[PDB]
Design an enzyme around this catalytic site. Structure first.
Site, mmCIF file in Angstrom:
data_model
loop_
_atom_site.group_PDB
_atom_site.id
_atom_site.type_symbol
_atom_site.label_atom_id
_atom_site.label_comp_id
_atom_site.label_asym_id
_atom_site.label_seq_id
_atom_site.Cartn_x
_atom_site.Cartn_y
_atom_site.Cartn_z
ATOM 1 N N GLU A 21 -7.141 24.521 -34.475
ATOM 2 C CA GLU A 21 -8.203 24.591 -35.477
ATOM 3 C C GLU A 21 -9.503 24.038 -34.983
ATOM 4 O O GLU A 21 -9.509 23.100 -34.174
ATOM 5 C CB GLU A 21 -7.822 23.901 -36.792
ATOM 6 C CG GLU A 21 -7.540 22.417 -36.675
ATOM 7 C CD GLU A 21 -6.978 21.772 -37.927
ATOM 8 O OE1 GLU A 21 -6.293 22.467 -38.716
ATOM 9 O OE2 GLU A 21 -7.227 20.560 -38.117
ATOM 10 N N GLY A 76 -1.239 24.678 -35.998
ATOM 11 C CA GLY A 76 -2.036 25.536 -35.130
ATOM 12 C C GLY A 76 -3.413 25.018 -34.738
ATOM 13 O O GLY A 76 -4.014 24.164 -35.422
ATOM 14 N N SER A 116 -1.942 25.778 -44.732
ATOM 15 C CA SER A 116 -1.865 25.177 -43.405
ATOM 16 C C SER A 116 -0.824 24.088 -43.287
ATOM 17 O O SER A 116 -0.715 23.270 -44.188
ATOM 18 C CB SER A 116 -3.215 24.658 -42.940
ATOM 19 O OG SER A 116 -3.055 24.199 -41.606
ATOM 20 N N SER A 117 -0.075 24.065 -42.157
ATOM 21 C CA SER A 117 0.935 23.036 -41.825
ATOM 22 C C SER A 117 0.159 21.856 -41.228
ATOM 23 O O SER A 117 -0.519 22.011 -40.198
ATOM 24 C CB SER A 117 1.934 23.556 -40.791
ATOM 25 O OG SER A 117 2.541 24.773 -41.195
ATOM 26 N N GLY A 153 -3.375 29.920 -39.089
ATOM 27 C CA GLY A 153 -3.464 31.124 -39.907
ATOM 28 C C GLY A 153 -2.746 32.335 -39.361
ATOM 29 O O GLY A 153 -2.621 33.338 -40.076
ATOM 30 N N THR A 181 4.622 29.627 -39.391
ATOM 31 C CA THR A 181 5.476 29.181 -40.506
ATOM 32 C C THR A 181 6.172 30.363 -41.119
ATOM 33 O O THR A 181 7.380 30.310 -41.338
ATOM 34 C CB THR A 181 4.664 28.404 -41.534
ATOM 35 O OG1 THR A 181 3.911 27.400 -40.850
ATOM 36 C CG2 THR A 181 5.528 27.761 -42.571
HETATM 37 N N1 LIG Z 1 4.534 38.421 -41.330
HETATM 38 C C1 LIG Z 1 3.724 38.189 -42.363
HETATM 39 N N2 LIG Z 1 3.854 38.954 -43.478
HETATM 40 C C2 LIG Z 1 3.029 38.733 -44.512
HETATM 41 N N3 LIG Z 1 2.053 37.823 -44.627
HETATM 42 C C3 LIG Z 1 1.966 37.060 -43.516
HETATM 43 C C4 LIG Z 1 2.726 37.187 -42.364
HETATM 44 N N4 LIG Z 1 2.341 36.250 -41.415
HETATM 45 C C5 LIG Z 1 1.398 35.566 -42.019
HETATM 46 N N5 LIG Z 1 1.116 36.005 -43.287
HETATM 47 C C6 LIG Z 1 0.071 35.514 -44.175
HETATM 48 O O1 LIG Z 1 -0.706 34.557 -43.481
HETATM 49 C C7 LIG Z 1 -0.690 33.303 -44.194
HETATM 50 C C8 LIG Z 1 -0.718 32.166 -43.203
HETATM 51 O O2 LIG Z 1 0.495 32.209 -42.432
HETATM 52 P P1 LIG Z 1 1.162 30.983 -41.730
HETATM 53 O O3 LIG Z 1 2.495 31.330 -41.189
HETATM 54 O O4 LIG Z 1 1.306 29.867 -42.739
HETATM 55 O O5 LIG Z 1 0.196 30.504 -40.559
HETATM 56 P P2 LIG Z 1 0.421 29.369 -39.464
HETATM 57 O O6 LIG Z 1 0.607 30.043 -38.076
HETATM 58 O O7 LIG Z 1 -0.846 28.540 -39.393
HETATM 59 O O8 LIG Z 1 1.560 28.445 -39.923
HETATM 60 C C9 LIG Z 1 0.536 33.380 -45.101
HETATM 61 O O9 LIG Z 1 0.329 32.608 -46.273
HETATM 62 C C10 LIG Z 1 0.585 34.859 -45.462
HETATM 63 O O10 LIG Z 1 -0.294 35.174 -46.539
HETATM 64 F F1 BEF Z 2 -2.459 26.934 -40.279
HETATM 65 BE BE1 BEF Z 2 -1.081 27.056 -39.583
HETATM 66 F F2 BEF Z 2 -0.025 26.287 -40.407
HETATM 67 F F3 BEF Z 2 -1.171 26.434 -38.172
HETATM 68 MG MG LIG Z 3 2.237 26.537 -40.390
#
Ligand SMILES: Nc1ncnc2c1ncn2[C@@H]1O[C@H](COP(=O)(O)OP(=O)(O)O)[C@@H](O)[C@H]1O
Ligand code: BEF
Ligand SMILES: [Mg+2]
Ligand SMILES: CC(C)n1c(=O)cc(N[C@@H](C)c2ccccc2)[nH]c1=O
Lengths: 781, 157
Positions: A454, A452, A230-231, A179, A183
């Site tokens: 969890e 990530g 989530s990835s 979260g 990504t």
């Molecule tokens: N730099 C950012 N700007 C805007 N929203 C963000 C940003 N980083 C994360 N988010 C929000 O957080 C959510 C989860 O981010 P994500 O990159 O998918 O997490 P993870 O580290 O698990 O891959 C996204 O869908 C978005 O709503």
């Molecule tokens: F939930 Be993130 F993609 F690790």
């Molecule tokens: Mg991810």
């Protein structure tokens, strides 16, 4: 605005104005009075010291609540000049509340990126800020850390700059809890190079790299409690460049997909996005093709958890997915083959079985089996006959085996996970095929986006594999920052005192990957057919309870699911459930059905299983996962890494809200403070004498005269000595010049400036030459 | 800052006054050069100032002031006296180092097209005509320049 004009509407979200800056430098502050005191609830609070009697300081909090604390407790606030600092390694007082409050203050101004010495920290804004446009991409292009605010575009450029200078492969290692923003930032690194490439299949390479992620995410991403997107697989994207730094090619390597999700969902989670995107009925033709309803509750494999997410528009996302396939140049046949196989998976779970009157399964109807076989280019009778009565070789003949209902139910699930996982690998190989150009490659900038860390109410094999990677990556950061760093100083004979930062996770990693470890015990148990979940649990406990510090008894709660052991990971203690790890690891498939898959009339399906072989082969899921992870780690060891540390602010997906204990737990287990300390205390930058002489002779050629051989070290000594720099900021090694933080940046500012002065004085002399030629002509007439 | 002491011999002043007549584009030969002509005169007399240094002696003139504004020898002489009072024009070794930044391989040769582009985009941009005329027959069989030779070349004359 001035220097901040190039960024446009983004400038107030990156760097505060001079008018805002000077208003801060006039704010009330008393060095002695204004401090930080701890709080049991909010970790630390700002305070003003009222009085102190008996090594017990009294003060008033920012909430207006008086309290008295001991010695260690009271920490110095940083003066108003340091407010919302861009690099925290430049703070006078470096402690936990100073780091936390600088992040909180910046985050409050929607400045999500902050440097931490040689690496960067980012806090999830849970809000889209106008900071990722092409205008910003151009504004960051070529800029040095000094002339540009913190941003993922900045990390990206700095990585590209070291690639061309050192002629060496770089990596961007984006860490964080599920979260956090990995990504999000991975896709911004890709955006940076794709936008820059657009300046000087169906779309162009740059459009294709950008479209690769919306495609894979439809199939490899899902809504879990901590992240709506989530990835469920990890990826490594290599962005290839030619000698001149022109974008050449790109490639994607994916890691262990969460196969379990295809047919199983916990209380607060969904199956893969694709199922719901298709069910959105945005493209009604897909429902007619797939012979499905528009109701997810009609499909048992996908309706166990949740089916709709507030933040997700599955109709809009289906359009995004379908277009991604068009841009990546997938044919209509290729796209529909993936859609038909997704629908076939949906129908597979609706295939019901009953017991033959007087212990063998038989079909409880055929409607869904007919629909599945139709989509999969199979004969439904062969498939049902193949699930109920699989063929097993009896030497020089074939004997059919019996199957009860539970065995058939297990088999159809396994085949569905196999088709799905293989269709995912097909899509990655297909994307890589479009992304492969005829163009030459010199180097790459690899981006790592892992699943990530969890913790669920139910943690299994899936979670151990996921968290093990996070542990392994955190230790890559520890080894690089604290181990190699200090070994380099000693190796080069730089006067150094070794510092134990207490950043070593080898103990834990060893409990997982080393022989007789959790994975090893599981892999050994897969060899014995008499082995059960309890025999495995027994082996784990025997070998590690009271022996391996990281392996503990489960910390079970009333109502909350059963666990068998608790593992003390870097990011927290996780209670694992070992039920079904043996089946999970061996992943057995009904080979009679896999044979019908090979003989399929659907070109796509036969291709997925042509190669098919796998055993307990004798290769397991854990064994292959450990293997691929070590291959990743040793390849990353031969790259210049750049770390991006994503911090999740709160557990409610609330923009602008910081949960002080949660942000603090992340800064601690990541070792952000320790990493800033090594930058400050050590020599973060260093250059080989040959490379130093080459690059900075320009700064003062007279120090290194052209006639004679000047020993490369004496050349560096006399050159730096001749400059207007702090002569305490550098130290001389056996092969390299070591620089204290910020000296290399100043050397680069001095070089850039001096180079421009030379160009102009060359051009001034050129002008003098062209003009004196024209004067000679005047003297003729 | 027109309040400068003239440390030129009576001989020097006559030799400059002689080159000055040559730039006299006036109909009646009123011994006046434009402000735009000033740079070309300083250059003719031996100096090689930067566009910026010339505009500094010209008291930062306007565009149609460079074309219209006239100056006599007496207002030109202090400008030459000031310009000549700067000798930090860059040594040979400095110029070579500056161009050595583009020698990607360190063989002593830079690609002819690269040096051209550098002079036309970086620092005080030179015109495509200025760089064509300046790079005239300077490239070898391979169409590249020995920057140590190019530097020696521009420094002499
Ligand atoms: N730099 C950012 N700007 C805007 N929203 C963000 C940003 N980083 C994360 N988010 C929000 O957080 C959510 C989860 O981010 P994500 O990159 O998918 O997490 P993870 O580290 O698990 O891959 C996204 O869908 C978005 O709503
Ligand atoms: F939930 Be993130 F993609 F690790
Ligand atoms: Mg991810
Ligand atoms: C991270 C550190 C050890 N480092 C340096 O401190 C300098 C490097 N190379 C020099 C030649 C350089 C100077 C200016 C810009 C880019 C690279 N490489 C480095 O890897």
């Amino acid at each position: 605005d001035a220097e901040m004009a190039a960024f446009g509407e983004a400038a107030p979200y990156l760097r505060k104005s001079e008018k805002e800056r000077l208003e801060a430098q006039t704010r009330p502050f008393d060095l002695k009075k204004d401090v930080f005191v701890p709080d049991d609830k909010e970790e630390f609070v700002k305070a003003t010291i009222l009085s102190r009697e008996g090594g017990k300081v009294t003060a008033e909090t920012e909430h207006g609540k008086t309290v008295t604390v001991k010695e260690d407790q009271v920490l110095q606030q940083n003066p108003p000049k340091f407010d919302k600092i861009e690099d925290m390694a430049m703070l006078t007082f470096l402690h936990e509340p100073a780091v936390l409050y600088n992040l909180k203050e910046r985050y409050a101004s929607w400045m999500i990126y902050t440097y931490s010495g040689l690496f960067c920290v980012t806090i999830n804004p849970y809000k889209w800020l106008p900071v990722y446009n092409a205008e910003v991409v151009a504004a960051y292009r070529g800029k040095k850390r000094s002339e540009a605010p913190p941003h993922i575009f900045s990390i990206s450029d700095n990585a590209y700059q070291y690639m061309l200078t050192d002629r060496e492969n770089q990596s961007i290692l984006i860490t964080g809890e599920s979260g956090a923003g990995k990504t999000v930032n991975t896709k911004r690194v890709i955006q940076y190079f794709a936008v820059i490439a657009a300046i000087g299949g169906k779309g162009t390479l740059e459009d294709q790299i950008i479209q690769a992620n919306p495609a894979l995410e439809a199939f490899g991403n899902a809504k879990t409690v901590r992240n709506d997107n989530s990835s469920r697989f990890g990826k490594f994207i290599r962005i290839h460049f030619g000698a001149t730094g022109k974008l050449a090619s790109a490639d994607i390597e994916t890691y262990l997909l969460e196969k379990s999700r295809v047919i199983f969902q916990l209380k607060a989670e969904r199956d893969y996005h694709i199922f719901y995107q298709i069910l959105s009925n945005k493209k009604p033709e897909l429902l007619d093709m797939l012979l499905i309803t528009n109701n997810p509750y009609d499909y048992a494999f996908i309706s166990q958890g949740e089916t709709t997410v507030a933040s997700i528009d599955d109709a809009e996302e289906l359009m995004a997915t379908d277009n991604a396939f068009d841009v990546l140049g997938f044919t209509t046949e290729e796209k529909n083959s993936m859609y038909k196989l997704t629908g076939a998976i949906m129908h597979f779970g609706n295939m019901k079985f009953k017991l033959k009157q007087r212990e063998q399964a038989e079909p409880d109807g055929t409607e869904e089996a007919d629909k599945s076989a139709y989509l999969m280019g199979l004969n439904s009778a062969d498939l049902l006959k193949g699930l109920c009565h699989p063929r097993v070789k009896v030497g020089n003949e074939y004997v059919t085996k019996g199957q009860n209902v539970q065995q058939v139910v297990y088999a159809k699930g396994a085949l569905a996970k196999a088709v799905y996982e293989r269709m995912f690998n097909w899509m990655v190989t297909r994307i890589n095929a479009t992304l492969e150009t005829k163009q030459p490659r010199q180097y790459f900038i690899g981006v790592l986006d892992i699943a990530g860390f969890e913790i669920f109410d139910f943690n299994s094999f899936e979670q151990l594999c996921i968290n093990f990677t996070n542990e392994k990556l955190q230790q890559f950061f520890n080894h690089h920052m604290f181990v190699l760093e200090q070994e380099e100083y000693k190796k080069e004979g730089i006067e150094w005192e070794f510092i134990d930062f207490g950043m070593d996770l080898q103990a834990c990693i060893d409990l997982i990957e080393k022989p007789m470890g959790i994975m090893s015990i599981l892999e050994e148990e897969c060899m014995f057919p008499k082995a059960t979940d309890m025999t495995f649990k027994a082996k784990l406990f025997d070998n590690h309870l009271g022996k391996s510090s990281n392996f503990q008894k489960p910390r079970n709660i009333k109502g909350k699911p059963e666990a068998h052991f608790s593992l003390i990971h870097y990011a927290g203690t996780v209670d694992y459930n070992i039920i079904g790890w043996l089946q999970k690891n061996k992943d057995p498939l009904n080979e009679t059905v896999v044979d019908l898959y090979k003989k399929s009339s659907l070109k796509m399906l036969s291709s997925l299983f042509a190669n098919y072989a796998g055993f307990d082969s004798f290769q397991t899921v854990s064994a292959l996962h450990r293997e691929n992870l070590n291959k990743l780690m040793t390849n990353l060891r031969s790259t210049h890494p750049h770390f991006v540390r994503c911090i999740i602010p709160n557990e409610t997906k609330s923009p602008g809200v910081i949960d002080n204990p949660l942000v603090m737990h992340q800064l601690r287990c990541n070792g952000v403070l320790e990493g800033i300390r090594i930058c400050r205390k050590g020599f973060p930058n260093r250059i080989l004498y040959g490379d130093f002489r080459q690059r900075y002779r320009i700064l003062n050629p007279a120090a290194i005269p052209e006639g004679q051989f000047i020993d490369s070290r004496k050349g560096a000594e006399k050159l730096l000595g001749s400059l207007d720099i702090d002569h305490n900021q550098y130290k001389f090694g056996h092969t390299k010049v070591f620089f204290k933080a910020g000296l290399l940046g100043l050397l680069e500012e001095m070089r850039d400036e001096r180079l421009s002065r030379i160009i102009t004085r060359i051009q001034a002399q050129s002008r003098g030459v062209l003009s004196r030629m024209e004067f000679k002509k005047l003297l003729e007439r | 800052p027109s309040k400068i002491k003239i440390e030129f011999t009576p001989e020097q002043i006559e030799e400059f006054k002689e080159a000055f007549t040559l730039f006299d584009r006036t109909p009646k030969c009123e011994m006046k050069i434009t402000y735009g002509q000033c740079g070309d005169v300083l250059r003719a007399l031996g100096q090689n100032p930067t566009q910026a240094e010339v505009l500094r002696v010209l008291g930062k003139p306007k565009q149609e002031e460079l074309n219209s504004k006239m100056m006599d020898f007496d207002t030109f002489l202090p400008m030459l006296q000031h310009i000549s009072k700067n000798k930090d024009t860059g040594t040979y070794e400095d110029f070579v180092e500056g161009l050595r930044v583009f020698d990607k391989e360190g063989n002593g040769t830079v690609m002819g097209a690269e040096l051209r582009h550098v002079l036309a985009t970086l620092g005080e941009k030179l015109t495509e005509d200025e760089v064509e005329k300046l790079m005239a027959g300077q490239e070898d069989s391979n169409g590249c320049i020995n920057y140590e030779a190019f530097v020696k070349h521009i420094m002499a004359g």
